[PDB]
Design a protein around this ligand. Structure first.
Ligand SMILES: N[C@@H](CCC(=O)O)C(=O)O
Ligand SMILES: N[C@@H](CCC(=O)O)C(=O)O
Ligand code: NA
Ligand code: NA
Lengths: 249, 250
């Protein structure tokens, strides 16, 4: 029976609502939970879902080299799978393995409609409107490591105000955009969910990069390639598309 | 040195235009040739480019189990890599390995502008406008296997008209759209290149599926994971985007 680590994140993973108490895997629902169930049907495994304790996706500490979040769970073999909106990135791929992508996306900007802001460059050239990202995720790492002037500029701004502009979760960032003059750097798939529910909000500019979400496994795990094959079947049958429609003004 | 199989297909791989005759790797240019060059630098290998002899991408004969095209070259261990617009697919992943995607795309429709045709369903429910795809490619195979009624019906139409409506290459399909009442089922990245050069053509409807192009290797090859990591590096530093812009350019 596989241990599956995951993280709360609408509409990928949420606590299911019921008038009565819920237990075990039945406590969860969402795109990624449907995915996991489909994978289990194809590959024939049983599983137990566990929310990652530190509530983080996974990044490496620049001082002591320690990983955290779901990535660390995999490295340490505390979980067999990570099934979540987990970005496949160069630094992660060096320490854990990934199925091929079940969704493709990119970093973009969440802000309000009807403003003069039309791009990342517009944000970088000013300081009145604050902007930030989720702490310890792929988006933050992209800016921290970027050698592109605009993004390097944006990282200087964010890192000099880490405490005030970086947030612990997408939900926290979305709330900042809704209640203050703030633009949030986040993934395009998730922006699409937000903007279908918050009609005053919109994506600003296009995609800043491109990346996929993959199922994570410890490095060398035979499940990575098996899950790739199952994902390809699910995509080709139209199932992933139906799941997207179900979960996603 | 590695042997690299590939296929001619604008703007991924082209014969370089020249008055002088060119030899060896010098003969080729394109998005996929730049990709290959970048990978060679990162991974530190040299290589010989060879066009796949049978001119096919790769499909399995549903009677005798035999594969052809670039997939076959890899299976037979005749090539170390296939660097081309080669779709990562369920059936192929069972017989060869792939890097993670350097490009993401979907099946869509290439047709003329100004008509009421707005979706695959609109094509499926009539016969006056013929439609088809590249023979023995991932696009045709998607239709051949789909349980979706609309796509199953389109397959019945195409398979029963194999000789007239399935073509040997994107190029032939594009010419057919331009010269006759015909809609061509083809990959969206390639449609984008075409519609930027032909202002009377357009994509019809959205993407019908989603897939990626990856570098193919024999199953079990150490190069699959190594190339994944190199692709991730190229993406993250902005090079894949610059490469697309260069070759795609109303
Ligand atoms: N999905 C991201 C977290 C959210 C973000 O960074 O925008 C990751 O895998 O780290
Ligand atoms: N790129 C496709 C060929 C073109 C198509 O099928 O539309 C393949 O890998 O088979
Ligand atoms: Na890895
Ligand atoms: Na494989």
């Amino acid at each position: 029976s596989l241990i599956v680590t995951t993280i709360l994140e609408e509409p990928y993973v949420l606590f299911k609502k019921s008038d009565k108490p819920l237990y075990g895997n039945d406590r969860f629902e969402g795109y990624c939970i449907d995915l996991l169930r489909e994978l289990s049907t194809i590959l024939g495994f049983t599983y137990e879902i566990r929310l990652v304790e530190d509530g983080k996706y996974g990044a490496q500490d620049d001082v002591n080299g320690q990983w955290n979040g779901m990535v660390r769970e995999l490295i340490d073999h505390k979980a067999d799978l990570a099934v979540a909106p987990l970005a496949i990135t160069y630094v992660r791929e060096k320490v854990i393995d990934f199925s091929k992508p079940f969704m493709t996306l990119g970093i973009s900007i969440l802000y309000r409609k009807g403003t003069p802001i039309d791009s990342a460059d517009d944000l970088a050239k000013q300081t009145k409107i604050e902007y930030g990202a989720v702490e310890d995720g792929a988006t933050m790492t992209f800016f921290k490591k970027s050698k592109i002037s605009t993004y390097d500029k944006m990282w200087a701004f964010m890192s000099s105000r880490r405490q005030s502009v970086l947030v612990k979760s997408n939900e926290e960032g979305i709330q900042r955009v809704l209640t203050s003059d703030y633009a949030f750097l986040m993934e395009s798939t998730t922006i699409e969910f937000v903007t279908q529910r918050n009609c005053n909000l919109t994506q600003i500019g296009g995609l800043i990069d491109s990346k996929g979400y993959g199922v994570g496994t410890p490095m060398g795990s035979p499940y990575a390639d098996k899950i790739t094959i199952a994902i390809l079947q699910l995509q080709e049958e139209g199932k992933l598309h139906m799941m997207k429609e179900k979960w996603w003004c």
